Amino acid sequence: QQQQLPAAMADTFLEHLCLLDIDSEPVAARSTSIIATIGPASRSVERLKEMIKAGMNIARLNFSHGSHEYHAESIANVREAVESFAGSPLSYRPVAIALDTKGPEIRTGILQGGPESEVELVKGSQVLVTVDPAFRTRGNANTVWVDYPNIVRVVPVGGRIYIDDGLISLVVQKIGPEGLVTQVENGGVLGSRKGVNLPGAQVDLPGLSEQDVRDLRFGVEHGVDIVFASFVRKASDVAAVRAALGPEGHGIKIISKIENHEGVKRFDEILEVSDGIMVARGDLGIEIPAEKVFLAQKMMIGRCNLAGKPVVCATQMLESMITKPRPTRAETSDVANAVLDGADCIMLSGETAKGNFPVEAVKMQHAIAREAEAAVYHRQLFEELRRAAPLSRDPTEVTAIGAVEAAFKCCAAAIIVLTTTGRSAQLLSRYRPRAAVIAVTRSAQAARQVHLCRGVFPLLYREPPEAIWADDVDRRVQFGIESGKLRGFLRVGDLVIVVTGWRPGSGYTNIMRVLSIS
Amino acid sequence: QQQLPAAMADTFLEHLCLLDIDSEPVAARSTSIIATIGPASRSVERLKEMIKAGMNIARLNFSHGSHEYHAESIANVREAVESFAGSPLSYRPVAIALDTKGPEIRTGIESEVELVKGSQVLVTVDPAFRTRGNANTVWVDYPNIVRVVPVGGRIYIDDGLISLVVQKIGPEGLVTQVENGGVLGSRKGVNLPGAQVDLPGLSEQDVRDLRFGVEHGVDIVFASFVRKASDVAAVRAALGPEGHGIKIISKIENHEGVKRFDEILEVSDGIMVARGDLGIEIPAEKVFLAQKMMIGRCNLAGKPVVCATQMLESMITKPRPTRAETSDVANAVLDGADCIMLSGETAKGNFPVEAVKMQHAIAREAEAAVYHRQLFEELRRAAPLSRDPTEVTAIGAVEAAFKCCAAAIIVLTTTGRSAQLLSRYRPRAAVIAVTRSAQAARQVHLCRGVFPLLYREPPEAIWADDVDRRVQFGIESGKLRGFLRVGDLVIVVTGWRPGSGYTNIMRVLSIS
Amino acid sequence: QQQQLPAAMADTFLEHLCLLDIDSEPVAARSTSIIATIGPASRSVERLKEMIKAGMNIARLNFSHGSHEYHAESIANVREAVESFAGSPLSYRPVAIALDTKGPEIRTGISEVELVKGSQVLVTNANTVWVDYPNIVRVVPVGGRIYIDDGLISLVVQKIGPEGLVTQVENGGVLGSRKGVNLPGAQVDLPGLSEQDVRDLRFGVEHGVDIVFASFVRKASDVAAVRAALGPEGHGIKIISKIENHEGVKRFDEILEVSDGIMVARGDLGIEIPAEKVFLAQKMMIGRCNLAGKPVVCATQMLESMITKPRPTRAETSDVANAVLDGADCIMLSGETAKGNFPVEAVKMQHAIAREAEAAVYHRQLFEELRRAAPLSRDPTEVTAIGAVEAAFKCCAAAIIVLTTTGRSAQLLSRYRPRAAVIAVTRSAQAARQVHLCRGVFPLLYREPPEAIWADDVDRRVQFGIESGKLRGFLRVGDLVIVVTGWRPGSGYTNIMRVLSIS
Amino acid sequence: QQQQLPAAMADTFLEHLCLLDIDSEPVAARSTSIIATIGPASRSVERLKEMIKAGMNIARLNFSHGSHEYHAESIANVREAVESFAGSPLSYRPVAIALDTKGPEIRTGILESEVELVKGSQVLVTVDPAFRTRGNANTVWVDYPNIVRVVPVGGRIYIDDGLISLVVQKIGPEGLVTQVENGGVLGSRKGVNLPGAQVDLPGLSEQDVRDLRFGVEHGVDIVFASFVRKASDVAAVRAALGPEGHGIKIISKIENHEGVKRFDEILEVSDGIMVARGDLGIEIPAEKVFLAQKMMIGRCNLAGKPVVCATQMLESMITKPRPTRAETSDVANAVLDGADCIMLSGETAKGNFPVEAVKMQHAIAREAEAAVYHRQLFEELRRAAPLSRDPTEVTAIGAVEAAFKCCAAAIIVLTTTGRSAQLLSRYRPRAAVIAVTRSAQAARQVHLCRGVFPLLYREPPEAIWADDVDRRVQFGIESGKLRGFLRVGDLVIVVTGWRPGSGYTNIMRVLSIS
Ligand SMILES: [K+]
């Protein structure tokens, strides 16, 4: 059959593997959301329109670069591209906007004739790392300047300094009033303003800088839906982000980025107070050995799956597509395996920010994700999500597991749920139904935010409330169905599970019913 | 409480190791009890005791007694049952089942006579021989016996305690050596294992008895000696179109019935493992194999299965059962039987209410000891994909009930079918079935864990109100009967429009 | 098709049940041991020979009844029946003898009398009942129940409790002479042992009994007291603790740790706790003994009706089969062999039910869970054992042949519940008899003096295991066999597993 | 803790994931074999010694390029580096040599010149042999004449490993008129793919036959057969290998749609499988390759046969010293899939970091092997494997079971052909399988089996066979202690047979290392 149904029926996992078929075609409804980083290559309204058509669900604003007005315009261009489809409300796709904070970054300085200048740090060389503003524009083959004054106090003799995504390596030999004398361990070529990593050194930069508070308040005052909080090391780092957003930003989802050894080891306490997680493999693969990142990835996704909270896998997923129109075999493998790992979202960075094929990269992620979602061994995944989820007396969670068990029984095409904040939809999403979870909401922000929950397809209902409440409920269900037929999710003859509550307002989801599509 | 550390276990072995004798069963008893009506259990006042003890189905054994006798049984059972209708929140429906005589073979005619082991014995069918059988001649009321048991075959008399080996097909009978001597009363039952009996699948007496059951409104027929699908059709023909609502439980009693089981189960409403006859027809050490096989396949099919015969046999004379009898009851419940049965323990024994009480107490403990983990998983994985909204709602409701350890699943049903579809996934939570059909209320006693409630008030002017007062009726009866407490969660299962077949809704509610 | 192999290969338990087949014939070798009680019905040498051929493996001497010389005559008759087959070394079946201790038994005195319900009776005739437990007047408070005769008789103590307990018959019935008395729910004082039990135990040591069924064991101390009273020559005698009351069940783990094995004594246990809960105690105890690798015995009223009837009831056949399915190593006949009219028939019945039931075990899941639950081990005997059972399941080997001195090699194979018969070849006469407690072990007593070179003495015992197996119908010319041996003489060094074709 | 055994013991797969720990070091030796492709960057003896030291187990000779004498030179340098470590018998690491055939390839023509094909320019594909040397920005020549009649209008023609694409505008007399879809710099003699086309090229060309006979006479251990479509193709390779090539292992490369759908019949007649992801990702949608990889690894694991994952595992390390996140993740996930081997192509044939690429695969494989959920894997392999009466497989599964029970460090097995080692490896023990053999070829070939560590025994036989048996066991122990697989106080399982010669394995022992 299609959607790898024979591999879904399998006795065992081994026999499930043996029955996967390249000829079996998947469902149109791709359920892992795609996050695209906005930059020069993806900033135009018309480019953004093609990225929404290819499947982008979350636009990422990287506040490591750009002014407040630069980002204000990209927010504007995105909202303009998005609302361009609002005329046909049965196809309208909400697109969320995420603010990715700069955080405690450390960067080198501008070199000799700044523009495009290159300097090769020869292996075996002596190089000085300086924090004197005189040497800030002074970069050469024996001098590097950094924007971290206290670097001279936290990197001991014998400590290793990484430059340019870890391809350059220095080892401190002496400390002096002129800075730190280092012997180059791993040479290479050095541009301007490259990131620096000090794994193991006790960096004293605050988790939330003075500009970060400014950036967060910007996002509140421009209406961002999601904050990606960089270099989160502890539960108190999430609290600072929460305070910074203040009462006006209480509705904003905080995804903590796990980027170093501390964040991995303090993982459980970070997840407890976050809304979700980003496995930030770039920084992570410099901070810990590269052959261990996948362990960190598979652990955090497992624990996020268990807890029911969104997990994002990020960085170098389709790296070569910066330059080439087709990805490497390792790159398609990587996207597929993050979907099979259980990730809710996958990310593109340079591939959409500055490469020559941003729309093709999104297309590629969409096509790989549809095949991989079909190849999940739902039989063991659902059974294990059931056993690991504790007993509950909340009617929303009880209705939710009932509806997912019901959806597997009839191979339902979808589970239509009414939700004010998204919570009813997220509780469905955490049992990983194969049926699409079609969330009908009046909340524009909730429509956007549910893109973090795998398998939730948001629909923004906008018609005004009807006189009788039960008629308003029925109308939104009918909106779910006809949006779903128009988008290819549903066909006449399908069964659908419909989830609703007994009274208006959030928190009262308690009804599940089985409907045939006529 | 309720052996849930054992229900929590990751493996069956760990599950056994964690069973606790000091864990009391909170749940109500879910396996129905059938009691056979006889001289020990016919007075209105005795029946009342037996109802309170827990009897859910009364079995009329049509192997004995005149039609007027069984009409008296029916009238007495109904009087004792309606004795409680004045309090509708606690009224227990009780089904009435008619057990057919069948293709019985008996010997000829307090009085006794011994047949010596190794004796030479004659079997003949001659009509004047019928009157005086001696220690060397046995007469049977089956003429074709002389054609059906060839040389070397065995003839069993009196519950298989006496056997005979045929040596030659004589001219005026069958010359047999006694293999197992014993002392033989008058007109006792004969079994012919490994014999092709041409006796009709439904005799003319059975047809009169099934018409009687229709006229008197029995809910259930236990059809004796069912060998093939066509035997069920003869029963369904004798019941006629007027008896279409009566459930047919086929009694598997011999080797053929075991071999043709799949074809029998498919045309029946359910099965009775009749271990008495079956343990004569096949070696006694094989009955448990047949019992577990048949309970298994009925479980897979979602059809009722009854375990019957000698479960508490010693309680005919003694006030306490043996250790083998208590484990037999428990193990039939563990196997997955929907019903367990008493025959002589209630028909003629000295302790009929005690035996009912013993089964009820054993059923409660054993139902708690079921390894629900592996069972619900295997049942949902074995059950095929369904597009029927009633079945889809059922499994969703059962999964929801396990998630919040709901005390009850309250369902509205007209034919019982929605209750039965919940029953087949074996919820731990009670299935409380609210129906206006008095007959359906009696018949769903066949399904394990269904507790019927007969709603008596006329339909409210607004249907949605009629549904809600039925649901509240389920809640109020539950609280009175100890199934529900204030603050519990219940799952409520209904349909989107009146009439049967439209169940499709599942809600979670908190009591009060 | 045979041995219920379709049901054994099913992927789920439910499918396993659905595939069970009344027409699938089982293997000749029954693996659950049969324990028969000796009594008037089972005491003649001729009869005992017939019971051995019907499959008795352990003969139980009930020291609750009879005198010391009575029991020594039983032992002599047992051994004369057993040793009548000793001219046949390849078919010789060891038969163990087990001493079931009297223990803290309370019995009435000395014909028959009826006790009407509501009557006033005194515990010191129809109104008087004598008891052989002096401290009963001190441990039964007022309102406390006294059960007599398998718990059929109920009594409740009146507020008078001085020179004899004045009582009220709570459940009337008929009372014989010297019938048991049970005092549940009231905390008792009677010693763990007695002078009779000590001397009974010592008599057991003098006459070479192999096993002790220790009555009414509620603590580790009881088992130590039993092993103490058995004396320095009493080592080597296996001690089965009989769990008989509420205290012994809930302190089970500390008892099993100290004991060689367990007997679920449902007779008394069904009086001491509600009868509805015995099956819980039975399944809990068999599971825990299975998890521990220690033999468990299921006992009492298994074929009760066969005391007077040639054919069991449907519940009795069911109960035997379900004890075997639960995992019991042994099953017992008490009155059915000791005093009834059909002692050989009752042994034949248990033998026939057990063979059917053993094939109907869902081995696939049983083996998996026994593996997962058994801990890691650096003992080469334990490592070789689970290797060999796993190898046995892959080739459907007819048997695992094992050389053992103490039986411990055989017991460690047996704890993984292999389907293949474990054929244990030993020189220790007593060990050959004691391994009947372990399901699946078929002991062979090797009688030859040792060969010069130890490696030829090993091959010879291995072939002795083959030839015996072929003669008895365990093995045949196409069967594959696993041979488990050791790298040096003396017990404790098992470490080799070989796969061989039985020529 | 170590070896991820908290995650190994978890009762569910989800819980096993949750317990994976980056601080848990792998102590088991590396079990997935590393195959390195020889080329300019890896043909010096000096670099080959560093690659053997970093982890290389098999050297791949790519017969798509280079003359026979070129390949004889590679073989000779490989052997010189490998025998540079003989003379220390307890640490000598065998290295197998594998011959990767050319197969039915399709190449463009001769143009060191380069031509740019620009996006949306119109290009002609011609077979006309006059144009064999006249290629430019709008005409391409291909060595496959029937390409005119098998590519319909609108079909696709891929050049340059799928980089450049051509949609057929029109078909005419001069050839196929096409337009660039994606342009790129087109070199001479580049590879061409025809997805969804009928290519009737023979499985075995004459030069392939010539190449196979070259490998027999130079004693290669393995043949990687390109573009296997059917069982018939494997028989042709075995036939061309001749009577002297009896003992050569044939790994079938699955490269296109047909080999995937005829996989079972190909698997039954092959010694093993390579997922050839480069060609395969051009012939089928790139989004479907992971499916075929996982299907094929599963079936080979089920069948107990070696499976190789290949192509672009560490591709960025051709020019960069450190791989990308996707690349490390890819290697880890191939080991977790169950691959017996992982492969390097341009990373070691031509890139600038050949030794480091090997090192990186070794370090990733070690972390991944410990992250295998052994509990479910061994259980499923047990019940999935059929009942057997061969005593070598009965012993193997008994020995693998015993090994898990005592957490043995090693299973020492004596083997002549390698078969008894392979029958242990198919049950995926965590304990290393230390295989002692006198057969130097078998020593090289069992690198195909995950978790097998070959030791080449060189002493002459002893007069009494029992003594010869046991000093071979002792050779494995001492080799194991020297290498770190084994330590005083460990338990090992020893697998041996009852009679000399192959096929008679049937004994398993548990012994303490002293
Ligand atoms: K950032």
CB-based burial of residue A102 (10 Å sphere; 0-12 exposed, 13-18 middle, 19+ buried)?
middle
| Chain D: closest CA distance from residue A304 (Å) | 9
Test D326 with A319 for CB contact under 8 angstroms. yes
Q: What is the largest CA-CA distance in chain B?
A: 80
Instruction: Spell out the CATH class of D375-512.
Output: alpha beta
- Counting one residue from chain C and one from chain D, the pairs whose CB atoms sit within 8 A come to 92
Residue type, B78: R
Test C12 with B314 for CB contact under 8 angstroms. no
Which two tokens mark B461? 């002017």
Cα–Cα distance for residue pair D22/A297, rounded to 1 Å? 10
Q: Catalytic one among B46, B52, B101, B106?
A: B106
| Chain A: closest CA distance from residue D299 (Å) | 5
Q: Catalytic one among D238, D253, D305, D426?
A: D253
Q: Catalytic one among D37, D178, D311, D392?
A: D311
* Residue C179 annotated as part of some ligand binding site: yes
**CA torsion, ordered A493, A499, A504, A505, to nearest 10 deg:** -130
A136 in Cβ contact with A159 (< 8 Å): no
Which two tokens mark B42? 């016919």
Cα–Cα distance for residue pair D393/C418, rounded to 1 Å? 18
Please state which of the four CATH numbers 3.40.366.30, 3.10.28.10, 3.20.20.60, 3.40.50.10860 is assigned to the domain occupying D31-103+203-371: 3.20.20.60
Distance between Cα A228 and ligand 1 center (Å): 8
Residue type, A66: G
What CATH number is given for C113-182 in this structure?
Answer: 2.40.33.10
Contacting D with CB below 8 Å, chain C residues are 364, 368, 372, 376-378, 380, 382-384, 386-388, 390-391, 394-396, 480, 482, 487, 495-501
Distance between Cα A322 and ligand 1 center (Å): 19
What CATH number is given for B373-510 in this structure?
Answer: 3.40.1380.20
Nearest CA in chain A to D362: A291
Cα–Cα distance for residue pair B484/B470, rounded to 1 Å? 16
CB-based burial of residue A292 (10 Å sphere; 0-12 exposed, 13-18 middle, 19+ buried)?
buried
* Residue B323 annotated as part of some ligand binding site: no
* End-to-end C-alpha distance for chain C, whole angstroms: 24
Test A330 with D330 for CB contact under 8 angstroms. yes
| Chain B: closest CA distance from residue A23 (Å) | 23
Is residue D311 flagged as an active site residue? yes
What CATH number is given for A31-103+207-373 in this structure?
Answer: 3.20.20.60
Residues of chain D found within 8 Å of residue A306, distances taken between Cβ atoms: 14, 18
C146 in Cβ contact with C171 (< 8 Å): no
Cα–Cα distance for residue pair C80/D358, rounded to 1 Å? 77
Distance between Cα A240 and ligand 1 center (Å): 17
Is residue A43 flagged as an active site residue? no
**Least CB–CB distance from A167: residue in D320, D332, D367:** D320
Distance between Cα A62 and ligand 1 center (Å): 5
* Residue A505 annotated as part of some ligand binding site: yes
Test A285 with D328 for CB contact under 8 angstroms. yes
Which two tokens mark C188? 């008792």
| Chain B: closest CA distance from residue C478 (Å) | 29
Task: From D343, D512, D492, D360, select the one nearest D429 (Cα to Cα).
Answer: D492
B476 in Cβ contact with B89 (< 8 Å): yes
Nearest CA in chain B to A379: B381
Angle at which helix A293-307 crosses helix A329-341, to 10 degrees, equals 30
Contacts of A155 (CB under 8 A, 6+ apart): A161, A172, A180, A198, A201
- In what helix (H) or strand (E) does residue D34 lie, and over which residues does it extend? strand D33-37
Which two tokens mark B400? 């929801």
Task: From A360, A427, A436, A380, select the one nearest A399 (Cα to Cα).
Answer: A427
Cα–Cα distance for residue pair C212/C434, rounded to 1 Å? 11
Residues of chain A found within 8 Å of residue B377, distances taken between Cβ atoms: 383
DSSP code, position B134:
B
Cα–Cα distance for residue pair B435/B444, rounded to 1 Å? 11
Task: From D412, D345, D435, select the one nearest D39 (Cα to Cα).
Answer: D345
Please tell me the experimental approach by which this structure was elucidated.
X-ray
Please state which architecture CATH assigns to domain B114-191: Beta Barrel (2.40)
The domain segmentation of chain A, as residue ranges, is: 31-103+207-373, 119-197, 379-516
| Chain D: closest CA distance from residue A248 (Å) | 35
List, by residue number, the catalytic residues of C.
60, 107, 242, 300
Please state which architecture CATH assigns to domain C364-501: 3-Layer(aba) Sandwich (3.40)
* Residue C446 annotated as part of some ligand binding site: no
B423 in Cβ contact with B431 (< 8 Å): yes
Return the half-sphere exposure (C-beta side, CA atoms, 13 A cut-off) of residue A174: 6
Test A410 with B505 for CB contact under 8 angstroms. no
| Chain C: closest CA distance from residue B504 (Å) | 28
* Fold category of B31-102+201-366 in CATH: TIM Barrel (3.20.20)
Distance between Cα B366 and ligand 1 center (Å): 61
Test A18 with D299 for CB contact under 8 angstroms. yes
Q: State the chains in contact with A (3 or more Cβ–Cβ pairs under 8 Å).
A: B, D
CA dist A310 → A305, A416, B489 (Å): 8, 20, 29
Distance between Cα A257 and ligand 1 center (Å): 10
* Fold category of C31-103+193-357 in CATH: TIM Barrel (3.20.20)
Cα–Cα distance for residue pair C374/C382, rounded to 1 Å? 10
Distance between Cα A253 and ligand 1 center (Å): 16
Q: Catalytic one among B31, B36, B107, B309?
A: B309
Residue C424, helix vs strand vs coil: strand
If you write DSSP's letter for every residue of C12-67 in order, what string do you get?
SHHHHHHH--TTPPPPS---SEEEEE-SGGG-SHHHHHHHHHTT--EEEEETTSS-
CA dist B90 → B25, B359, B442 (Å): 21, 21, 15
C42 in Cβ contact with C51 (< 8 Å): yes
**Least CB–CB distance from D298: residue in A14, A331, A337:** A14
For every residue of B5-17, which 3-state class applies, written as one string?
HHHCCCCHHHHHH
Interface residue of D9, D383, D405 to substitute, partner C, most C CBs within 10 Å: D405
Return the half-sphere exposure (C-beta side, CA atoms, 13 A cut-off) of residue A500: 21
Radius of gyration of chain B (CA): 24
Cα–Cα distance for residue pair D338/D305, rounded to 1 Å? 11
Read off φ and ψ for residue C122, nearest 5 degrees: -120, 135
Helix, strand, coil shares of chain C as percentages rounded to 5?
Answer: 40, 20, 40
Q: Same fold for the domain at A31-103+207-373 and the one at A379-516?
A: no
Instruction: Spell out the CATH class of A119-197.
Output: mainly beta
Distance between Cα A60 and ligand 1 center (Å): 10
The stretches of D321-390 forming alpha helices (DSSP H) are 325-337, 346-349, 354-370, 374-384
Test A512 with B509 for CB contact under 8 angstroms. no
* Fold category of D115-193 in CATH: M1 Pyruvate Kinase; Domain 3 (2.40.33)
Interface residue of D379, D390, D401, D514 to substitute, partner C, most C CBs within 10 Å: D401
Please state which of the four CATH numbers 1.10.533.10, 1.10.3210.10, 3.40.1380.20, 3.40.50.700 is assigned to the domain occupying A379-516: 3.40.1380.20
Residue type, D98: A
* Residue A419 annotated as part of some ligand binding site: yes
